[PDB]
Design a protein around this nucleic acid. Structure first.
Lengths: 55, 48, 117, 150, 110, 103, 142
RNA sequence: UGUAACGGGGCUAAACCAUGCACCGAAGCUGCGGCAGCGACGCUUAUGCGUUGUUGGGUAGGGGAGCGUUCUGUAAGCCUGCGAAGGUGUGCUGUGAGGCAUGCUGGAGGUAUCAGAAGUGCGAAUGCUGACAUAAGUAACGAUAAAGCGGGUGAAAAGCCC
RNA sequence: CCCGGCGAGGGGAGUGAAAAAGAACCUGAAACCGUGUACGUACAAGCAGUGGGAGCACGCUUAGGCGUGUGACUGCGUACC
């Protein structure tokens, strides 16, 4: 359960090739306030789909 | 004469044997005393 | 006096690490593996000077055999004809003629085919 | 080396290499294998070999025209500017002056001169005859270095 | 104008920040700010603060116009890791390394 | 228009004006040399194959330079037998400029 | 001066038709290997594919001497528990006839990427027709 | 475990026996170029010039000749703020250890030649000390008594306060 | 002075001969870890080199090619003590 000899930096980067983060495609623009937010998430301002829900 | 022109007679200095200073030096790695045994050891060798 | 040995050891290691340029992995960086790789390279280079002198001769022999069999004679009977006509052109120039100058190789084939018969 | 003679770990069982002292020369801060002592490097020269080298050195000091014999060499004040003007007048820059009787008037006004050292005739030494560019010697001091050597 | 901005001895590892810093290379700095806003990582918070500070330096210490800026070169490389003893079992010791990093953001208009 | 000839223990195949590097001769850096032993002279179509050193034809060549080649490094090693050895080698040449292939 | 070395762009490779109607398998395959490797061209180069594309028709009509029609067995392993599959000559001639000359030539070619390339040169067909008439291949009798 | 008793393809010769001539084939031998050791021989023996002949795989081991580092004398000399030691590239050069010049960094020392002395040359000793990798962003985050919500405060609250 | 959390850290300013001499402070190597550019690499098997060698990219030129970097393919080749 221990390595027989050390793995190279070559085999390190190949394994970390799948560890890359995926950025969001794009954010949405609300109809009234026009601020950016995630899809299907209420704004930091409390707007969601043209409707203020939370002060 | 000068102090930087003096020189000994040819054959005066022999410069000694430095045991253990590489492959190409002749002696080196066992320094001329063979492989294992009582003569190979530090302080070893039988008495007179 | 006490001799410190930073500069002479660093010089001896830069000497070996400079010859290991182009080697994969720790053979280009780590000194021990670089030293083994450099001595292995020197051994192979000696051996391959000898093997180069062999491999080019067998390449020329294959080219002369192909171009002579284009003319209708195998390499053994072609070399025997050129030897019995006392022609001292070696296999290097016969390969160079075989590739470049087909009519000169044709005349050499006709000379060997005259000399064998 | 200041330290204890205790084994730093066990003989077996531990993963590390064997060791039996922290004063071992392989170790750091604890050390030297073949440490040094104060030693007398002075080596014996035979009297005939010393005097043979002295006669060879004086003969080559003549034969290379670096020997100058002056009958009287003295300075009449202990001022060094008088000795400096005397060696400037004699075209002398780096000299060994050998006088058969050590007068203090000459010895004191040659102290601050770098290239000029004045020896008695008994204080003649061979590296001082080689090392100096010119040697001037009093006539009775020439007679003295004769009657000592040969 | 190159306009470097650094966060030296950043309390995070170089790999954990490098994972975030490989997302905003070459990006126009509005979309880079929006990406670092909507990335749910602590390295995104650190890298977003250095990017905002680099914008501020490029507006103040030299001329203007953040609407034409673009992130040329952002790189993270490790700093001085501090050594802490973590006691493991059966009496033995263990030295865990609290790793730091240096986050450098270079944003230009070019 | 080319000739085959034995210069320094090996055949060369040279054309007009070209410069060929071969072994060291006792020729100055600014002198002439005449290779009268020519093995094969080909001119257009007329190929004169030499039942040795054909007939009459003499190659004229001028020595350009006399330097030593690149250094090869001989490493002689024997694993676990406590033996290694290095030696450099730089092989002299003469560069001759072929001035004329005589027919 | 140095030697000659063929370049992988300026090599000209002709197309050839060979009929294997009633021939020995090994001697046919040997001349195929000779042409496919490039041992016949005067600008032969070992590290360059200088061979000529060969179309081999009537690949089920190739013959063998002796009892090798029934006695020559073709072993290959599936890489599995213990599956060693074997086929004689006539059953391979019935089922996949082109693979006979494929394996026979593939054993006489070099090993590595280059031998795989000069085996990609070979276009063997079991029938008398071929679809490569756009390449205008000459008849090669041997 | 898989053909698995030609190395393989394949071979009725591409097998065997006899004969014959070619060719391939080594670092062998020969051709050309260079270095060295030994022995004869004459030059007038700077005990080096040449001519020939022969030798030149090497462990343990014997013998011979050199390189480099630090320090002392030469040296209150010589190089050096129009740039030293060091570091890092490049190019020449020697049979080799090596040497020399030079671009960049550095910002004050270096040291010829010929001698002298060594804490004089590291890859290995489960070598010693410091640094940094590897497994790896993996295991784990320490009792399975248990948390949820509202307001606060703050740049930020699952954990703090109420 | 600006970003930052009346931070940490940084960018200008200013001192200085020099701030890649900024207090983690002369020089600042190697291992180790990055960013950018050139080449190679997703049908090809193994001490990772060595001999041959195309292409590509850079410099230059007696305009013939060299020099530098990588190096498909190919013969040979099972590390050191």
């Amino acid at each position: 359960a221990v390595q027989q000899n050390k793995p190279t930096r070559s085999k390190r980067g190949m394994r970390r090739s799948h560890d890359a983060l995926t950025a969001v495609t794009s954010l949405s623009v609300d109809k009234t306030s026009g601020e950016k937010h995630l899809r299907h998430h209420i704004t930091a301002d409390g707007y969601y789909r043209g409707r203020k829900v939370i002060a | 004469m000068r102090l930087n022109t003096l020189s000994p007679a040819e054959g005066s200095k022999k410069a000694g044997k430095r045991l253990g200073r590489g492959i190409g030096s002749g002696l080196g790695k066992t320094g001329g005393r063979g492989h294992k045994g009582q003569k190979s050891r530090s302080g070893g060798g039988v008495r007179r | 006096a006490r001799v410190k040995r930073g500069v002479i050891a660093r010089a001896r290691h830069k000497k070996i690490l400079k010859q290991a340029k182009g080697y994969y992995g720790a053979r280009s960086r780590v000194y021990r593996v670089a030293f083994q790789a450099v001595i292995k390279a020197g051994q192979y280079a000696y051996r391959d000077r000898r093997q180069r002198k062999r491999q080019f001769r067998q390449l020329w022999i294959a080219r002369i055999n192909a171009a002579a069999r284009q003319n209708g004679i195998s390499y053994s009977k072609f070399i025997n004809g050129l030897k019995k006509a006392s022609v001292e052109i070696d296999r290097k120039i016969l390969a160079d003629i075989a590739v470049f100058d087909k009519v000169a190789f044709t005349a050499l084939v006709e000379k060997a085919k005259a000399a064998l018969a | 080396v200041t330290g204890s003679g205790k084994k730093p770990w066990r003989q077996k069982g531990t993963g590390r290499a064997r060791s039996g002292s922290i004063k071992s020369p392989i170790w750091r801060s604890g050390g030297v294998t073949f440490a040094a002592r104060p030693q007398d490097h002075s080596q014996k020269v035979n009297k005939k070999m010393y005097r043979g080298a002295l006669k060879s050195i004086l003969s080559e000091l003549v034969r290379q025209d670096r020997l100058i014999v002056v009958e009287k060499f003295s300075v009449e004040a202990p001022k060094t500017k008088l000795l400096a003007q005397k060696l400037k007048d004699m075209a002398l820059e780096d000299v060994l002056i050998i006088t058969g009787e050590l007068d203090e008037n000459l010895f004191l006004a040659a102290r601050n001169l770098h290239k000029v050292d004045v020896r008695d005739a008994t204080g003649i030494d061979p590296v001082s005859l080689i090392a100096f560019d010119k040697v001037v010697m009093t006539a009775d001091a020439v007679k003295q270095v004769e009657e000592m050597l040969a | 104008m190159e306009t470097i901005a650094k966060h030296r001895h950043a309390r995070s590892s170089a790999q954990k920040v490098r994972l975030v810093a490989d997302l905003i290379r070459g990006k126009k700095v509005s979309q880079a700010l929006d990406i670092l806003t909507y990335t749910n990582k602590k390295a995104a918070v650190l890298v977003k603060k250095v990017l905002e500070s680099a914008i501020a330096n490029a507006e103040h210490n030299d001329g203007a116009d953040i609407d034409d800026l673009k992130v040329t070169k952002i790189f993270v490389d490790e700093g001085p890791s501090m050594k802490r003893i973590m006691p493991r079992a059966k009496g033995r010791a263990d030295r865990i390394l609290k790793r730091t990093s240096h986050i450098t953001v270079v944003v230009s208009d070019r | 228009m080319y000739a085959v000839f034995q210069s320094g223990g090996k055949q060369h195949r040279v054309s007009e004006g070209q410069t060929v590097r071969l072994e060291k001769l006792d020729i100055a850096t600014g002198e002439t040399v005449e290779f009268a032993e020519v093995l094969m002279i080909a001119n257009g179509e007329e190929v004169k194959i030499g039942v040795p050193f054909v007939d009459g034809g003499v190659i004229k060549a001028e020595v350009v330079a006399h330097g030593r080649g690149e250094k090869v490094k001989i490493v002689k090693f024997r694993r676990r037998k406590h033996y290694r050895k290095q030696q450099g080698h730089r092989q002299w040449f003469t560069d001759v400029k072929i001035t004329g292939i005589s027919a | 001066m140095k030697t000659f070395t063929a370049k992988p762009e300026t090599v000209k490779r002709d197309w050839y038709v060979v009929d294997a109607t009633g021939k020995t398998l090994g001697r046919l395959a040997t001349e195929l290997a000779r042409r496919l490797r490039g041992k016949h061209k005067a600008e032969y180069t070992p590290h360059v594919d200088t061979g000529d594309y060969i179309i081999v028709l009537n690949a089920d009509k190739v013959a063998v001497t002796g009892n090798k029609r029934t006695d020559k067995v073709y072993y290959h392993h599936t890489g599995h528990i213990g599956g060693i599959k074997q086929a004689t000559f006539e059953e391979m001639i019935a089922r996949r006839p082109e693979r006979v000359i494929e394996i026979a030539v593939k054993g006489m070619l070099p090993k590595g990427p280059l031998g795989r390339a000069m085996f990609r040169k070979l276009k063997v067909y079991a029938g008398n027709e071929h679809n490569h008439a756009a390449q205008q291949p000459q008849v090669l009798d041997i």
